[PDB]
Design an enzyme around this catalytic site. Structure first.
Site, PDB file in Angstrom:
ATOM      1  N   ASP A  17       0.816  -1.209   0.000  1.00 21.01           N
ATOM      2  CA  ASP A  17       0.000   0.000   0.000  1.00 21.01           C
ATOM      3  C   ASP A  17       0.854   1.265   0.000  1.00 21.01           C
ATOM      4  OD1 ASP A  17      -2.904  -0.953   0.295  1.00 21.01           O
ATOM      5  OD2 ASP A  17      -1.913  -2.052   1.914  1.00 21.01           O
ATOM      6  N   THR A  52      14.655   1.303   1.111  1.00 25.23           N
ATOM      7  CA  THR A  52      13.466   2.007   0.650  1.00 25.23           C
ATOM      8  C   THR A  52      13.827   3.072  -0.382  1.00 25.23           C
ATOM      9  OG1 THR A  52      11.363   2.917   1.456  1.00 25.23           O
ATOM     10  CG2 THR A  52      13.373   4.012   2.170  1.00 25.23           C
ATOM     11  N   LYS A  88      14.005  15.132   1.151  1.00 24.58           N
ATOM     12  CA  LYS A  88      14.160  14.208   2.270  1.00 24.58           C
ATOM     13  C   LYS A  88      15.586  13.683   2.412  1.00 24.58           C
ATOM     14  CE  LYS A  88      10.669  11.566   3.438  1.00 24.58           C
ATOM     15  NZ  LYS A  88       9.400  11.676   4.209  1.00 24.58           N
ATOM     16  N   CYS A 222      32.746  32.675 -20.077  1.00 19.90           N
ATOM     17  CA  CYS A 222      33.401  32.641 -21.375  1.00 19.90           C
ATOM     18  C   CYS A 222      34.409  33.774 -21.466  1.00 19.90           C
ATOM     19  CB  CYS A 222      32.371  32.757 -22.500  1.00 19.90           C
ATOM     20  SG  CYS A 222      31.377  31.270 -22.758  1.00 19.90           S
ATOM     21  N   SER A 230      54.559  37.427 -31.572  1.00 18.64           N
ATOM     22  CA  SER A 230      55.798  37.384 -30.803  1.00 18.64           C
ATOM     23  C   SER A 230      55.859  36.120 -29.949  1.00 18.64           C
ATOM     24  CB  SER A 230      55.908  38.626 -29.915  1.00 18.64           C
ATOM     25  OG  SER A 230      54.634  39.197 -29.675  1.00 18.64           O
ATOM     26  N   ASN A 434      33.672  34.455 -28.782  1.00 11.91           N
ATOM     27  CA  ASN A 434      33.980  33.366 -27.861  1.00 11.91           C
ATOM     28  C   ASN A 434      33.522  32.015 -28.399  1.00 11.91           C
ATOM     29  OD1 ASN A 434      31.179  34.239 -27.391  1.00 11.91           O
ATOM     30  ND2 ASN A 434      31.207  32.738 -25.720  1.00 11.91           N
ATOM     31  N   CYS A 436      30.993  30.285 -27.495  1.00 14.15           N
ATOM     32  CA  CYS A 436      29.551  30.324 -27.696  1.00 14.15           C
ATOM     33  C   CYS A 436      29.195  31.112 -28.951  1.00 14.15           C
ATOM     34  CB  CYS A 436      28.868  30.954 -26.479  1.00 14.15           C
ATOM     35  SG  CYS A 436      29.011  29.982 -24.962  1.00 14.15           S
ATOM     36  N   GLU A 438      28.691  34.279 -29.181  1.00 16.95           N
ATOM     37  CA  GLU A 438      27.753  35.373 -28.910  1.00 16.95           C
ATOM     38  C   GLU A 438      28.319  36.645 -28.264  1.00 16.95           C
ATOM     39  OE1 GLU A 438      27.372  35.515 -25.301  1.00 16.95           O
ATOM     40  OE2 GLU A 438      28.949  34.035 -25.670  1.00 16.95           O
ATOM     41  N   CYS A 459      32.820  37.918 -19.905  1.00 14.64           N
ATOM     42  CA  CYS A 459      31.397  38.130 -20.107  1.00 14.64           C
ATOM     43  C   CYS A 459      30.571  37.470 -19.018  1.00 14.64           C
ATOM     44  CB  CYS A 459      30.970  37.605 -21.480  1.00 14.64           C
ATOM     45  SG  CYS A 459      30.568  35.842 -21.512  1.00 14.64           S
ATOM     46  N   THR A 621      21.113  24.364 -20.415  1.00 14.30           N
ATOM     47  CA  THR A 621      20.572  24.053 -19.098  1.00 14.30           C
ATOM     48  C   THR A 621      19.710  25.192 -18.567  1.00 14.30           C
ATOM     49  OG1 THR A 621      22.799  24.667 -18.338  1.00 14.30           O
ATOM     50  CG2 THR A 621      22.180  22.340 -18.197  1.00 14.30           C
ATOM     51  N   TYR A 727      26.623  29.898 -36.288  1.00 12.43           N
ATOM     52  CA  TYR A 727      26.701  28.845 -35.277  1.00 12.43           C
ATOM     53  C   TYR A 727      26.207  27.496 -35.825  1.00 12.43           C
ATOM     54  CZ  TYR A 727      27.693  27.967 -30.344  1.00 12.43           C
ATOM     55  OH  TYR A 727      28.268  27.562 -29.161  1.00 12.43           O
ATOM     56  N   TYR A 728      26.573  26.418 -35.137  1.00  9.12           N
ATOM     57  CA  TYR A 728      26.403  25.047 -35.612  1.00  9.12           C
ATOM     58  C   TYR A 728      25.617  24.989 -36.919  1.00  9.12           C
ATOM     59  CZ  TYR A 728      27.518  24.171 -30.655  1.00  9.12           C
ATOM     60  OH  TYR A 728      28.107  24.157 -29.412  1.00  9.12           O
TER      61      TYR A 728
HETATM   62  N1  LIG Z   1       7.301  -0.798   4.150  1.00  6.52           N
HETATM   63  C1  LIG Z   1       7.482  -0.372   2.728  1.00  6.52           C
HETATM   64  N2  LIG Z   1       7.403  -1.285   1.750  1.00  6.52           N
HETATM   65  C2  LIG Z   1       7.563  -0.905   0.472  1.00  6.52           C
HETATM   66  N3  LIG Z   1       7.801   0.380   0.145  1.00  6.52           N
HETATM   67  C3  LIG Z   1       7.886   1.321   1.098  1.00  6.52           C
HETATM   68  C4  LIG Z   1       7.726   0.963   2.421  1.00  6.52           C
HETATM   69  N4  LIG Z   1       7.855   2.069   3.167  1.00  6.52           N
HETATM   70  C5  LIG Z   1       8.088   3.097   2.329  1.00  6.52           C
HETATM   71  N5  LIG Z   1       8.108   2.643   1.079  1.00  6.52           N
HETATM   72  C6  LIG Z   1       8.325   3.398  -0.135  1.00  6.52           C
HETATM   73  O1  LIG Z   1       9.709   3.805  -0.477  1.00  6.52           O
HETATM   74  C7  LIG Z   1       9.712   5.179  -0.634  1.00  6.52           C
HETATM   75  C8  LIG Z   1      10.545   5.923   0.416  1.00  6.52           C
HETATM   76  O2  LIG Z   1       9.852   6.637   1.439  1.00  6.52           O
HETATM   77  P1  LIG Z   1      10.626   7.766   2.242  1.00  6.52           P
HETATM   78  O3  LIG Z   1      11.322   8.681   1.215  1.00  6.52           O
HETATM   79  O4  LIG Z   1       9.546   8.567   2.965  1.00  6.52           O
HETATM   80  O5  LIG Z   1      11.712   7.228   3.224  1.00  6.52           O
HETATM   81  P2  LIG Z   1      11.397   6.057   4.203  1.00  6.52           P
HETATM   82  O6  LIG Z   1      12.733   5.532   4.775  1.00  6.52           O
HETATM   83  O7  LIG Z   1      10.799   4.886   3.389  1.00  6.52           O
HETATM   84  O8  LIG Z   1      10.499   6.608   5.370  1.00  6.52           O
HETATM   85  P3  LIG Z   1       8.986   6.205   5.550  1.00  6.52           P
HETATM   86  O9  LIG Z   1       8.707   4.853   4.913  1.00  6.52           O
HETATM   87  O10 LIG Z   1       8.667   6.120   7.065  1.00  6.52           O
HETATM   88  O11 LIG Z   1       8.088   7.258   4.902  1.00  6.52           O
HETATM   89  C9  LIG Z   1       8.292   5.636  -0.679  1.00  6.52           C
HETATM   90  O12 LIG Z   1       7.979   5.787  -1.999  1.00  6.52           O
HETATM   91  C10 LIG Z   1       7.517   4.623  -0.080  1.00  6.52           C
HETATM   92  O13 LIG Z   1       6.452   4.323  -0.911  1.00  6.52           O
END
Ligand SMILES: Nc1ncnc2c1ncn2[C@@H]1O[C@H](COP(=O)(O)OP(=O)(O)OP(=O)(O)O)[C@@H](O)[C@H]1O
Lengths: 735, 34
Positions: A17, A52, A88, A222, A230, A434, A436, A438, A459, A621, A727-728
């Site tokens: 889940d 995770t 995070k 750049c 010389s 340069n 670039c 430009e 520049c 970029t 340019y290119y």
């Molecule tokens: N018990 C789990 N089993 C499978 N996937 C997990 C589980 N717990 C977290 N995840 C997934 O891995 C990812 C990492 O979550 P996060 O960046 O929040 O760090 P975390 O160490 O997993 O902390 P937390 O799970 O308490 O949120 C999330 O996408 C989450 O869905």
């Protein structure tokens, strides 16, 4: 049971889940985005003790791979999944710590410069925290995001640790660039600028965003350097290039001075060895920092087309040839002028000379077009002088070939870069441009690696997003916000070589680049090939330039006026609105709209804080950080593709939802004519040279072979509208 | 129509319901007026 290793370190059982909910957080407020899709896409392979972090990593790339034209939102979907991980991985938790607290923490870590803790009291910091909108991190398109995870953000490159956040980065730079400012306007500008850049309304050079707020004091991007025939001079150039490439800077060498092969040395005691020997050395220097020579160190060399070795030079970028006869690691820009093109159209020849066998022949090339013409014919009909005749139709032909054969041999019309330059041809003649392509700034050779006289064009530039301003007027604010902020960097960035510091503080040349031009022209219906954007462009660029000069002119009161300002023609009362090629009126009938005379005098009276504010540069970029379109050149396709560190990146062109019709993709263009016509217009207001590139399609040409005719034809077109450089040349590859 | 409109949450399913198994002259140049 099943196991999992939370990033925290502790163990846990698999929770199928918890994943779903994460994808949801992303799919929130999105369409065509299947939560179930990304899962199966990713083939996420589970195994005990899997971290995770890694698990989360998998989905990020998976979601990024489903970013198709039919799924524009997926670009933003994965973006949200990404921003999460980063924040995070640098804060322990999803919500970043207070401005003050953080700034301090990173200081003692060696990552942020304590320079801020001294110029700002806690109060002011906690106050600025208000302007900070962390939520803006959810306004990024994964394309830009991935880049932030490397170049922009402060991080530990060995360990991987990311110490910083996306608005966190923005604000610090804004203040750290306005620190040394009055107590009363200083907090204010800190916010007005922050929003201008945080909202992608004004993009800045890659080098800047990373290091403002860190130990390093250098923002140089750049640089240009003119070498002297010389012996001693070259040795210095050799050193300078290394000093500057050692700080990852693009190089702009001008060896058009090395005296030709065979030329006398010391009388008749020894004959010269040629320019080539000196040119190859230049390359090892720019690569002094590069692994295997594959990447890094970019050197573009410039030289006269009438040189006695012009023929020698063209071959070198080509891979088909003997080693000792080819310097293939660097780009080259052929210098041309008004007499040159003339010879071609008359099927007449081109007498090749040596810079050292002729007097006044060179200097004249850059500054005065008559003298070079008067002098030329003199020696041309003179036999005493080592010369070499070669049919023009025979020369231009060769040159053009290598240009399409490699796509690195650029062109630069000297006369235009002097008769339409803010500088005076006599006093500070521009001899080079340069890597670039430009930047049109004045140059001087160095007797020593630290010569007092030497001038090294430095520049510094920032960019205005046309896709971020509702009306032309909005620029006037952003103008001062950029010009001011930029001019400040010049006093904050240390200059390696002295010849640069002097030449820099002296004119404070500022380069301003515009991006997202493709989206703009489309948002108004106009296109490149029909040229219906000719007027729309004239009116647009007319503004961008006006406000910039007004923003600078204004500063010419607040913090002095320019050191060398007198040299420039601007002080002489000359404006860039009365120097453009007369040919242009013919493709644009949009009269000026903002009183110019007002500044014509205001700048006579007060002056300018800078010598140049208008230039066009193509940036890889800067464009994708705002999800905007590269420089001005239109996109090659709706679904932009690139390889990041991961190797899959997708960027949908601004607003594909209603914008599909209005976009004229680089290959959809009938011919190059359309493109040039718009460029020539931009020049009428650009102080410095647009990075306009030509594009051809063999697949559209009889017998599938781009006709020389067309190639040459186009070159004349550019020169006819006052185009500064080329340019290119990218041909329609992938077939 | 009662259920809210939507985009197929699963598109991966479709797999299973589809049909299951150089020119140079001074001629053209001479004329241009740079
Ligand atoms: N018990 C789990 N089993 C499978 N996937 C997990 C589980 N717990 C977290 N995840 C997934 O891995 C990812 C990492 O979550 P996060 O960046 O929040 O760090 P975390 O160490 O997993 O902390 P937390 O799970 O308490 O949120 C999330 O996408 C989450 O869905």
């Amino acid at each position: 049971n099943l196991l999992v290793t939370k990033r925290d370190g502790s163990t846990e059982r698999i929770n199928l889940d918890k994943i779903h909910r994460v994808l949801d957080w992303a799919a929130e407020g999105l369409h065509n985005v299947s939560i179930s899709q990304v899962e199966l896409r990713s083939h996420i392979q589970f195994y005990d003790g899997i971290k995770t972090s890694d698990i989360h990593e998998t989905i990020i790339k998976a979601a990024a791979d489903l970013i198709s034209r039919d799924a524009p939102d997926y670009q933003y979907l994965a973006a949200r999944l990404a921003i999460f991980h980063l924040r995070k991985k640098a804060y322990g938790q999803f919500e970043p710590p207070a401005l003050y607290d953080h700034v301090v923490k990173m200081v003692e870590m060696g990552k942020y410069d304590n320079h801020l803790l001294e110029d700002y009291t806690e109060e002011e910091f906690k106050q600025m925290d208000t302007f900070i909108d962390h939520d803006r991190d959810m306004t990024f398109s994964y394309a830009a995001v991935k880049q932030l995870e490397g170049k922009y953000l402060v991080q530990n490159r060995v360990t991987g640790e990311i110490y910083e956040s996306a608005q966190f980065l923005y604000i610090l730079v804004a203040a750290c660039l306005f620190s040394n400012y009055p107590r009363e306007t200083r907090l204010q500008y800190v916010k007005r600028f922050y929003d201008a850049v945080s909202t992608f309304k004004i993009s800045l050079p890659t080098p800047i965003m990373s290091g403002v707020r860190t130990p390093t004091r250098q923002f140089s991007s750049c640089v240009l350097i003119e070498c002297g025939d010389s012996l001693d001079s070259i040795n210095a150039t050799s050193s300078a290039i290394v000093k500057y490439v050692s700080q990852r800077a693009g190089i702009g060498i001008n060896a058009g001075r090395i005296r030709a092969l065979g030329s006398p040395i010391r009388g008749g005691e020894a004959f010269h060895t040629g320019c080539i020997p000196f040119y190859k050395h230049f390359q090892t220097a720019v690569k002094s920092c590069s692994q295997g020579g594959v990447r890094g160190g970019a050197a573009t060399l410039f030289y006269p087309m009438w040189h006695l070795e012009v023929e020698s030079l063209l071959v070198l970028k080509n891979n088909r040839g003997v080693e000792g006869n080819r310097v293939r690691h660097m780009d080259y820009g052929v210098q041309i002028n008004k007499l040159m093109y003339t010879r071609l159209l008359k099927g007449e020849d081109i007498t090749l000379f040596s810079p050292s066998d002729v007097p006044g022949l060179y200097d004249a090339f850059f500054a005065d077009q008559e003298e070079f013409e008067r002098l030329y014919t003199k020696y041309e009909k003179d036999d005493s002088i080592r010369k070499q005749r070669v049919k023009a139709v025979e020369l231009f032909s060769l040159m053009m070939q290598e240009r399409a054969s490699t796509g690195r041999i650029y062109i630069q019309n000297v006369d235009h870069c002097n008769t339409h330059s803010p500088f005076d041809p006599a006093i500070a003649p521009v001899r080079q441009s340069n890597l670039c392509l430009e930047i049109a700034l004045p140059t001087k050779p160095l007797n020593d690696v630290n010569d007092e006289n030497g001038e090294i064009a430095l520049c510094t530039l920032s960019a205005f997003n046309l896709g971020a301003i509702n009306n032309l007027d909005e620029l006037e604010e952003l103008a001062i916000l950029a010009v001011r902020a930029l001019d400040a960097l010049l006093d904050y960035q240390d200059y390696p070589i002295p010849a640069a510091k002097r030449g820099a503080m002296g004119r404070r040349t500022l380069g301003i680049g515009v991006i997202n031009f493709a989206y703009y022209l489309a948002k108004h219906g106009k296109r490149y090939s029909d040229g219906s954007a000719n007027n729309l462009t004239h009116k647009t660029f007319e503004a961008i330039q006006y406000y910039l000069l007004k923003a600078s002119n204004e500063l010419a009161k607040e913090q002095g006026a320019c050191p060398w300002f007198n040299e420039t023609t601007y002080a002489k009362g000359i404006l860039p609105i009365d120097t453009y090629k007369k040919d242009l009126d013919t493709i644009a009938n949009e009269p000026l709209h903002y009183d110019w005379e007002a500044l014509r005098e205001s700048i006579k009276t007060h002056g300018l804080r800078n010598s140049t504010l208008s230039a066009l540069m193509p940036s890889e970029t800067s464009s994708q950080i705002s999800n905007a379109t590269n420089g001005i050149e239109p996109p090659r396709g709706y679904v932009s593709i690139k390889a990041s560190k991961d190797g899959i990146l997708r960027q949908v062109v601004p607003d594909y939802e209603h914008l599909h019709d209005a976009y004229e993709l680089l290959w959809e263009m009938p011919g190059n004519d359309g493109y040039l016509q718009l460029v020539g217009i931009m020049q009428k207001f650009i102080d410095q040279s647009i990075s306009a590139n030509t594009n051809y399609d063999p697949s559209r040409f009889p017998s599938g072979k781009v006709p020389m005719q067309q190639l040459l034809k186009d070159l004349l077109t550019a020169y006819k509208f006052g185009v500064k450089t080329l340019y290119y040349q990218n041909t329609r590859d992938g077939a | 129509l009662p259920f809210q409109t939507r985009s197929n949450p699963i598109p991966w399913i479709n797999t299973w319901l589809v049909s299951d198994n150089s020119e140079v002259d001074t001629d053209d140049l001479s004329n241009f007026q740079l």
